[PDB]
């Protein structure tokens, strides 16, 4: 439906995937990064029943499906499932066949190399895309957030990357990658809700909990005082209606789960928490850099959408930070959708039209080409 060969853009996380065309300010469609498969045989007539379900199809029929996420802590390990996701995403919802349009995909700065190689290879060999470009999520976060300098906390579903950037440059000596992410918060919430009498153990249940988390949970600006209150009074409880008509409420569990970001030991991770991890990214940088990073702490990705996270993070960094310095967190409405938006911005920059791998260079060099052409 496009009148120009605009790039198509897809931000494929370990959780959800956002897609649209370059030049827009939002994805046109959002899908989970899921290919679903039935674990049961349907009995009734008129119940659909597929061998496999993709994206929103996997969620709609999830009650009897195993829901597999092809991306593991930022890396695609199942390329067949990503082909199903990209065919559906580009061809059915964006309504564009990649054969006539270049495509931009994204990965974290320390994302395993095989990810960028398969993202590039799949689009060139299965979809015949005329060109490819694997973007840096840190760049995209900054372009969506209006910054060139700052701390990128991309808090994704599979990993929190945590990288300081100055004047458009990476400061790699200060990257503190953390294996604590949105996926662990969903798993932890299934377990804490179980403590309250509402057990969630299946894949369908995982998605229910994911929805509960997104609407009911928060980190709290003061964990211990909020906890003591929530544990003492119903005034901090919030209800949710489950698909079968049952009602679940969450008390101090409402924040004890999100608190895992600040206390990763709750899921068994060895870490000082998201705020020390973030701080580790601002003090390790040079003496004439630190001041600019403190004043430009940038959120992108999801989990940034907890009601109290921008303010608690600003407070925790301020507490760890030296005096005089201004500490500020940028937490735009483009939250969780920011990396996709940055992808749109990058794909269309005039300064980035020479960064694309063509389907000439690709075939002459093979899949490893992404290593020298992208970043």
């Amino acid at each position: 439906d496009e009148d120009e060969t605009t790039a198509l853009v897809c931000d494929n996380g370990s959780g959800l995937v956002k897609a649209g065309f370059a030049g827009d300010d939002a994805p046109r469609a959002v899908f989970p990064s899921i290919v679903g498969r039935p674990r049961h045989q349907g009995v009734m007539v008129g119940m659909g029943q597929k061998d496999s379900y993709v994206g929103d199809e996997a969620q709609s029929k999830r009650g009897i499906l195993t829901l597999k996420y092809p991306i593991e802590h930022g890396i695609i390990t199942n390329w067949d499932d990503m082909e199903k996701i990209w065919h559906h995403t580009f061809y059915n919802e964006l309504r564009v066949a990649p054969e006539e349009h270049p495509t931009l995909l994204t990965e974290a700065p320390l994302n395993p190399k095989a990810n960028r190689e398969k993202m590039t290879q799949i689009m060139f060999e299965t979809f015949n895309v005329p060109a490819m470009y694997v973007a840096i999520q840190a760049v995209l976060s900054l372009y969506a957030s209006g910054r060139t300098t700052g701390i990128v906390l991309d808090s994704g579903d599979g990993v929190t990357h945590n990288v300081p950037i100055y004047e458009g440059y990476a400061l790699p000596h200060a990257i503190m990658r953390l294996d604590l992410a949105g996926r662990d918060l969903t798993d932890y919430l299934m377990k804490i809700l179980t403590e309250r009498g509402y057990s969630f153990v299946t894949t369908a249940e995982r998605e229910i909990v994911r929805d509960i988390k997104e609407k009911l949970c928060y980190v709290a600006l003061d964990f211990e005082n909020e906890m003591a209150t929530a544990a003492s009074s119903s005034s901090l409880e919030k209800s949710y209606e489950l698909p079968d008509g049952q009602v679940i409420t969450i008390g101090n569990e409402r924040f004890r789960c999100p608190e895992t970001l600040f206390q990763p030991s709750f899921i068994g991770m060895e870490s000082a928490g998201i705020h020390e991890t973030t701080y580790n990214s601002i003090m390790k940088c040079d003496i004439d850099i630190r001041k600019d990073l403190y004043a430009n702490n940038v959120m992108s990705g999801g989990t940034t959408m907890y009601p109290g996270i921008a303010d608690r993070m600003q407070k925790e960094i301020t507490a760890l930070a030296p005096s005089t310095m201004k500490i500020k967190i940028i937490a735009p409405p483009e939250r969780k959708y920011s990396v996709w938006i940055g992808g749109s911005i990058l794909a269309s920059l005039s300064t980035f039209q020479q960064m694309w791998i063509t389907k000439q260079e690709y075939d002459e060099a093979g899949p490893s080409i992404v290593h020298r052409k992208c970043f």
Partner: protein, 46 residues
């Protein structure tokens, strides 16, 4: 009820549109405030 999801939705969308204009102003004003405060402190230090 018939038009109330629409009245509520139009209120939600109008409020969201105004919220955003005001949230963007809040961010612009806060960034100017912080920079201005840093200018203040710059000059106060001077």
């Amino acid at each position: 009820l018939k038009l109330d999801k629409e009245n509520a939705l139009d209120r939600a969308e109008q409020a969201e549109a105004d919220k955003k204009a005001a949230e963007d102003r809040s961010k612009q004003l806060e960034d100017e405030l912080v920079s201005l405060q840093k200018k203040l402190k710059g000059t106060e230090d001077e």
